[PDB]
Amino acid sequence: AEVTQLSNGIVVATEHNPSAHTASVGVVFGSGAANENPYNNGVSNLWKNIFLSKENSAVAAKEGLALSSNISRDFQSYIVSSLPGSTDKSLDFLNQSFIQQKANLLSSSNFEATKKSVLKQVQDFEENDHPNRVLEHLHSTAFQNTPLSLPTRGTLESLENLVVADLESFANNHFLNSNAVVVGTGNIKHEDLVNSIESKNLSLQTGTKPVLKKKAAFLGSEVRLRDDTLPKAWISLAVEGEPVNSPNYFVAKLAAQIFGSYNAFEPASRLQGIKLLDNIQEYQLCDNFNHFSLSYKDSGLWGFSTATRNVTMIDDLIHFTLKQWNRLTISVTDTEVERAKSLLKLQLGQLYESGNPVNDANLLGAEVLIKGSKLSLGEAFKKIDAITVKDVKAWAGKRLWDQDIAIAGTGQIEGLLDYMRIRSDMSMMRW
Amino acid sequence: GPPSGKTYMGWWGHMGGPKQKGITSYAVSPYAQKPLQGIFHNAVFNSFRRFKSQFLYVLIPAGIYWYWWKNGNEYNEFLYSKAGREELERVNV
């Protein structure tokens, strides 16, 4: 495989997979949820859903073109998938959708129907999807009074104040030339995409997006969304992780991989090679957990989210999990590092080299927006092979051993104790 | 072990209060928090508020009993002196 890249003010980056049967072509902007003030919050979600609106999707589906979109903290994307013989049709449709006009998408009826639909979706997310809203409050309290705290989904109190003028103001300030990368993944060649872009004009705007004064800074805090009428207790807990373009990126991900993920109901998940499972399976402390190493442009998060029904033994869950985290600084073995190497090679090659072209388009767009070129997977495997136990211990002493944490929880979290015992459990007192 | 009676305090998880919903907490780590930022202006004005709302309930009984003790002690050291010895004679008999 190979990733090429060229420039004319726009950036054209591709992945010619000749074995695939489709071809995704779309623009990936460099603005995201982290580029909004807290009063126009959710305008990226509303651009996602006016791009995926019914009239626009119908006009797309007349030629056999499926639309896709994604709103992250750092990057938006607007991807159009088609057969590999219709890349010109997809480019001309994306041109007509964004560049040539926006007033037909931003009519009164389409905007009011879409605002109604996104208000319904945000309310449905707020009162029914519990582990994701725990993770969103974890971001909202780890990075508070700072633009990386804003949720990608938007809030009900802000999103019902947006009108068309704010949509157009965000479009003029963020849908720009240098801010964007046009991405073609799947079964298209790079030269075909560049010659077809130069065949058209496809000039988004003049460019040079707002600087955004505040820089993301981690802030140890907690938020407790206690709802006694829920059957479980969802809780995330994280420290300041590593951002992208850091030398400790793969080390932070391998540290997340050491303790892995778990599902108490699957039989092959209870037999993993984690030493936390010997403590966690005896009295059935949780139903599931997953360790995440989230990496943003300015900062990052490293921690775990979990859910449990054993609501009287939440503190034992947090206790054994954090003592296992303290094992990284002091006495992590060689076999755990080798196992995490093999599993992280596995899940990283599943992530970057799955068969779905839209996910490849999102990942390639994000990576060539942030760091200018895509690191191919072989050099990634060499960087994973270069990690030793001393690198993990040095990273854990830098980032894990007695550092501030951020906690978010909802449900029956009365069994979760104060902030100070969870904070003081980050250092063992025995080392 | 045997079961016990109904108490009014459970434990962490089943404490026994009413069910609560939509009440959110917010707390910051004390490592990123400056302690004793609220000692100056606090130990003056809040301490004067806590004294003003709460002193008179202590000061009126202290005043009553100290005045009554002082009047009794003065009457003692009167009637065991030379001036009030006939009054001591008539009230001791």
GROMACS .gro file of N, CA and C in nm, chain B:
model
  279
  432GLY      N    1  -2.381  -1.482   5.905
  432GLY     CA    2  -2.429  -1.400   6.015
  432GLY      C    3  -2.579  -1.377   6.011
  433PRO      N    4  -2.638  -1.346   6.126
  433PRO     CA    5  -2.782  -1.326   6.132
  433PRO      C    6  -2.821  -1.193   6.071
  434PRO      N    7  -2.946  -1.177   6.029
  434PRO     CA    8  -2.993  -1.045   5.987
  434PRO      C    9  -3.021  -0.958   6.108
  435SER      N   10  -3.023  -0.828   6.085
  435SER     CA   11  -3.054  -0.733   6.190
  435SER      C   12  -3.173  -0.647   6.151
  436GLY      N   13  -3.211  -0.558   6.241
  436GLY     CA   14  -3.330  -0.477   6.225
  436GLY      C   15  -3.312  -0.367   6.122
  437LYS      N   16  -3.421  -0.296   6.096
  437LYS     CA   17  -3.417  -0.184   6.004
  437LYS      C   18  -3.350  -0.065   6.070
  438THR      N   19  -3.238  -0.022   6.014
  438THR     CA   20  -3.168   0.095   6.060
  438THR      C   21  -3.203   0.212   5.970
  439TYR      N   22  -3.152   0.329   6.005
  439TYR     CA   23  -3.173   0.450   5.927
  439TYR      C   24  -3.046   0.496   5.858
  440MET      N   25  -2.946   0.410   5.850
  440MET     CA   26  -2.827   0.436   5.772
  440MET      C   27  -2.781   0.304   5.713
  441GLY      N   28  -2.769   0.299   5.581
  441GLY     CA   29  -2.723   0.177   5.518
  441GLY      C   30  -2.573   0.176   5.503
  442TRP      N   31  -2.526   0.174   5.379
  442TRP     CA   32  -2.384   0.171   5.349
  442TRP      C   33  -2.367   0.237   5.213
  443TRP      N   34  -2.246   0.232   5.158
  443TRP     CA   35  -2.220   0.295   5.030
  443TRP      C   36  -2.288   0.215   4.920
  444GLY      N   37  -2.397   0.269   4.868
  444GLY     CA   38  -2.469   0.203   4.761
  444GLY      C   39  -2.616   0.192   4.791
  445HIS      N   40  -2.648   0.163   4.917
  445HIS     CA   41  -2.785   0.145   4.962
  445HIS      C   42  -2.808   0.222   5.091
  446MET      N   43  -2.771   0.350   5.089
  446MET     CA   44  -2.763   0.430   5.210
  446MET      C   45  -2.899   0.454   5.273
  447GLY      N   46  -3.004   0.460   5.193
  447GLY     CA   47  -3.138   0.470   5.246
  447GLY      C   48  -3.201   0.606   5.238
  448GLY      N   49  -3.139   0.701   5.169
  448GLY     CA   50  -3.203   0.827   5.143
  448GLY      C   51  -3.305   0.815   5.032
  449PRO      N   52  -3.373   0.925   5.004
  449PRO     CA   53  -3.468   0.925   4.892
  449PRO      C   54  -3.395   0.919   4.760
  450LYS      N   55  -3.465   0.869   4.659
  450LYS     CA   56  -3.409   0.862   4.525
  450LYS      C   57  -3.394   1.003   4.469
  451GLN      N   58  -3.279   1.030   4.409
  451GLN     CA   59  -3.249   1.164   4.360
  451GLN      C   60  -3.205   1.159   4.215
  452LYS      N   61  -3.243   1.262   4.141
  452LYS     CA   62  -3.229   1.261   3.996
  452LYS      C   63  -3.207   1.403   3.948
  453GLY      N   64  -3.114   1.420   3.855
  453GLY     CA   65  -3.093   1.550   3.796
  453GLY      C   66  -3.022   1.648   3.885
  454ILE      N   67  -2.947   1.600   3.983
  454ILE     CA   68  -2.869   1.685   4.072
  454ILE      C   69  -2.722   1.650   4.054
  455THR      N   70  -2.646   1.743   3.997
  455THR     CA   71  -2.512   1.716   3.949
  455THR      C   72  -2.410   1.783   4.039
  456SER      N   73  -2.300   1.715   4.063
  456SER     CA   74  -2.192   1.767   4.145
  456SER      C   75  -2.078   1.817   4.058
  457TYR      N   76  -1.999   1.907   4.115
  457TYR     CA   77  -1.881   1.958   4.047
  457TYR      C   78  -1.775   1.986   4.151
  458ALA      N   79  -1.660   1.921   4.140
  458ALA     CA   80  -1.553   1.939   4.236
  458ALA      C   81  -1.421   1.939   4.162
  459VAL      N   82  -1.324   2.013   4.215
  459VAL     CA   83  -1.193   2.025   4.152
  459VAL      C   84  -1.091   1.963   4.247
  460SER      N   85  -0.985   1.906   4.190
  460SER     CA   86  -0.878   1.846   4.269
  460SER      C   87  -0.812   1.951   4.358
  461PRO      N   88  -0.773   1.916   4.481
  461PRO     CA   89  -0.705   2.014   4.566
  461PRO      C   90  -0.561   2.039   4.525
  462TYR      N   91  -0.504   1.959   4.436
  462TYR     CA   92  -0.372   1.990   4.385
  462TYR      C   93  -0.375   2.109   4.290
  463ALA      N   94  -0.486   2.129   4.219
  463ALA     CA   95  -0.504   2.244   4.132
  463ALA      C   96  -0.584   2.354   4.199
  464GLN      N   97  -0.608   2.340   4.328
  464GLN     CA   98  -0.687   2.430   4.409
  464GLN      C   99  -0.594   2.494   4.510
  465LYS      N  100  -0.610   2.624   4.535
  465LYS     CA  101  -0.523   2.689   4.632
  465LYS      C  102  -0.590   2.689   4.769
  466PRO      N  103  -0.534   2.620   4.868
  466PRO     CA  104  -0.594   2.620   5.001
  466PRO      C  105  -0.561   2.750   5.073
  467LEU      N  106  -0.645   2.780   5.173
  467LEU     CA  107  -0.641   2.902   5.254
  467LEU      C  108  -0.633   3.029   5.170
  468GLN      N  109  -0.702   3.030   5.057
  468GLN     CA  110  -0.724   3.155   4.987
  468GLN      C  111  -0.832   3.238   5.055
  469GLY      N  112  -0.916   3.173   5.134
  469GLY     CA  113  -1.025   3.236   5.204
  469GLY      C  114  -1.001   3.238   5.353
  470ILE      N  115  -0.884   3.286   5.396
  470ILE     CA  116  -0.862   3.315   5.537
  470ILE      C  117  -0.868   3.465   5.564
  471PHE      N  118  -0.808   3.545   5.477
  471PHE     CA  119  -0.814   3.690   5.488
  471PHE      C  120  -0.940   3.735   5.415
  472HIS      N  121  -1.007   3.836   5.473
  472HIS     CA  122  -1.144   3.886   5.451
  472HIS      C  123  -1.249   3.791   5.508
  473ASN      N  124  -1.211   3.666   5.529
  473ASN     CA  125  -1.302   3.563   5.573
  473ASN      C  126  -1.308   3.562   5.724
  474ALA      N  127  -1.192   3.548   5.788
  474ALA     CA  128  -1.178   3.556   5.933
  474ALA      C  129  -1.208   3.695   5.990
  475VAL      N  130  -1.231   3.795   5.906
  475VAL     CA  131  -1.282   3.922   5.954
  475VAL      C  132  -1.433   3.927   5.934
  476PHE      N  133  -1.479   3.924   5.808
  476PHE     CA  134  -1.619   3.957   5.784
  476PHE      C  135  -1.712   3.840   5.813
  477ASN      N  136  -1.673   3.718   5.775
  477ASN     CA  137  -1.757   3.603   5.807
  477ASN      C  138  -1.758   3.577   5.956
  478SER      N  139  -1.644   3.598   6.023
  478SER     CA  140  -1.640   3.582   6.167
  478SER      C  141  -1.723   3.688   6.238
  479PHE      N  142  -1.730   3.809   6.183
  479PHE     CA  143  -1.819   3.907   6.243
  479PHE      C  144  -1.965   3.874   6.217
  480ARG      N  145  -1.996   3.815   6.101
  480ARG     CA  146  -2.134   3.771   6.076
  480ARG      C  147  -2.173   3.659   6.172
  481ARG      N  148  -2.082   3.562   6.191
  481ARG     CA  149  -2.108   3.450   6.280
  481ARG      C  150  -2.113   3.494   6.425
  482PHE      N  151  -2.047   3.605   6.458
  482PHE     CA  152  -2.059   3.656   6.594
  482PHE      C  153  -2.188   3.735   6.610
  483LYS      N  154  -2.227   3.813   6.509
  483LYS     CA  155  -2.342   3.902   6.523
  483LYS      C  156  -2.472   3.823   6.530
  484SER      N  157  -2.482   3.714   6.455
  484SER     CA  158  -2.606   3.639   6.455
  484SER      C  159  -2.623   3.551   6.578
  485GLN      N  160  -2.521   3.540   6.661
  485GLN     CA  161  -2.511   3.427   6.752
  485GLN      C  162  -2.459   3.466   6.890
  486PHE      N  163  -2.424   3.594   6.913
  486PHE     CA  164  -2.364   3.630   7.041
  486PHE      C  165  -2.467   3.657   7.149
  487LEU      N  166  -2.586   3.706   7.113
  487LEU     CA  167  -2.674   3.764   7.213
  487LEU      C  168  -2.742   3.657   7.296
  488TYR      N  169  -2.760   3.538   7.237
  488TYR     CA  170  -2.811   3.421   7.307
  488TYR      C  171  -2.714   3.369   7.411
  489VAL      N  172  -2.587   3.408   7.404
  489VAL     CA  173  -2.487   3.368   7.502
  489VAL      C  174  -2.467   3.484   7.599
  490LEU      N  175  -2.479   3.606   7.548
  490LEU     CA  176  -2.445   3.723   7.628
  490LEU      C  177  -2.554   3.759   7.727
  491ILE      N  178  -2.681   3.733   7.697
  491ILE     CA  179  -2.783   3.764   7.796
  491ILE      C  180  -2.783   3.666   7.914
  492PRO      N  181  -2.772   3.532   7.898
  492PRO     CA  182  -2.759   3.448   8.018
  492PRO      C  183  -2.632   3.471   8.098
  493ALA      N  184  -2.519   3.499   8.032
  493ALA     CA  185  -2.397   3.533   8.104
  493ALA      C  186  -2.414   3.662   8.182
  494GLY      N  187  -2.482   3.760   8.123
  494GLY     CA  188  -2.507   3.884   8.194
  494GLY      C  189  -2.597   3.867   8.315
  495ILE      N  190  -2.704   3.788   8.301
  495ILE     CA  191  -2.797   3.764   8.411
  495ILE      C  192  -2.728   3.692   8.526
  496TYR      N  193  -2.659   3.582   8.496
  496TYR     CA  194  -2.598   3.506   8.604
  496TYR      C  195  -2.475   3.572   8.661
  497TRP      N  196  -2.400   3.650   8.582
  497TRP     CA  197  -2.287   3.720   8.640
  497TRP      C  198  -2.331   3.835   8.727
  498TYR      N  199  -2.438   3.905   8.688
  498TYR     CA  200  -2.492   4.010   8.774
  498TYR      C  201  -2.550   3.953   8.902
  499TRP      N  202  -2.612   3.835   8.893
  499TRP     CA  203  -2.671   3.776   9.012
  499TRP      C  204  -2.564   3.722   9.106
  500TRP      N  205  -2.458   3.663   9.050
  500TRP     CA  206  -2.344   3.622   9.131
  500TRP      C  207  -2.274   3.740   9.195
  501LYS      N  208  -2.260   3.851   9.121
  501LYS     CA  209  -2.191   3.966   9.176
  501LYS      C  210  -2.271   4.032   9.286
  502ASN      N  211  -2.403   4.040   9.270
  502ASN     CA  212  -2.487   4.095   9.376
  502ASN      C  213  -2.487   4.006   9.499
  503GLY      N  214  -2.488   3.874   9.480
  503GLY     CA  215  -2.481   3.784   9.594
  503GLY      C  216  -2.348   3.789   9.667
  504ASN      N  217  -2.239   3.799   9.592
  504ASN     CA  218  -2.107   3.804   9.654
  504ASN      C  219  -2.085   3.936   9.727
  505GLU      N  220  -2.138   4.045   9.671
  505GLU     CA  221  -2.132   4.174   9.739
  505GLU      C  222  -2.214   4.173   9.867
  506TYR      N  223  -2.329   4.105   9.866
  506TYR     CA  224  -2.409   4.099   9.987
  506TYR      C  225  -2.346   4.009  10.093
  507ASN      N  226  -2.276   3.904  10.049
  507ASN     CA  227  -2.196   3.822  10.139
  507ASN      C  228  -2.089   3.904  10.210
  508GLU      N  229  -2.002   3.969  10.132
  508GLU     CA  230  -1.894   4.046  10.193
  508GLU      C  231  -1.943   4.172  10.262
  509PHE      N  232  -2.068   4.212  10.240
  509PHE     CA  233  -2.129   4.309  10.330
  509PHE      C  234  -2.159   4.247  10.465
  510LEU      N  235  -2.243   4.143  10.468
  510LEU     CA  236  -2.294   4.102  10.599
  510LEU      C  237  -2.194   4.022  10.682
  511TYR      N  238  -2.078   3.984  10.628
  511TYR     CA  239  -1.971   3.938  10.715
  511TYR      C  240  -1.867   4.045  10.741
  512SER      N  241  -1.907   4.171  10.739
  512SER     CA  242  -1.820   4.280  10.781
  512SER      C  243  -1.874   4.339  10.911
  513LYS      N  244  -1.811   4.447  10.957
  513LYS     CA  245  -1.852   4.509  11.082
  513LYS      C  246  -1.982   4.586  11.066
  514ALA      N  247  -2.011   4.633  10.945
  514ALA     CA  248  -2.128   4.718  10.925
  514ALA      C  249  -2.258   4.639  10.931
  515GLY      N  250  -2.257   4.516  10.883
  515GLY     CA  251  -2.379   4.439  10.875
  515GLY      C  252  -2.385   4.321  10.969
  516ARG      N  253  -2.319   4.332  11.085
  516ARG     CA  254  -2.317   4.218  11.176
  516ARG      C  255  -2.450   4.199  11.248
  517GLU      N  256  -2.525   4.307  11.273
  517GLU     CA  257  -2.658   4.288  11.332
  517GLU      C  258  -2.756   4.232  11.230
  518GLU      N  259  -2.736   4.262  11.102
  518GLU     CA  260  -2.818   4.200  10.999
  518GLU      C  261  -2.783   4.053  10.983
  519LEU      N  262  -2.654   4.020  10.997
  519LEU     CA  263  -2.613   3.880  11.001
  519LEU      C  264  -2.674   3.809  11.121
  520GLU      N  265  -2.685   3.880  11.234
  520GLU     CA  266  -2.748   3.823  11.352
  520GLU      C  267  -2.896   3.795  11.329
  521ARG      N  268  -2.966   3.885  11.259
  521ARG     CA  269  -3.109   3.864  11.243
  521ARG      C  270  -3.145   3.772  11.127
  522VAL      N  271  -3.058   3.756  11.027
  522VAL     CA  272  -3.089   3.663  10.918
  522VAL      C  273  -3.025   3.527  10.937
  523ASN      N  274  -2.928   3.514  11.027
  523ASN     CA  275  -2.873   3.383  11.058
  523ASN      C  276  -2.954   3.313  11.165
  524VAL      N  277  -3.041   3.386  11.234
  524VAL     CA  278  -3.130   3.330  11.335
  524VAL      C  279  -3.274   3.345  11.288
   0.00000   0.00000   0.00000
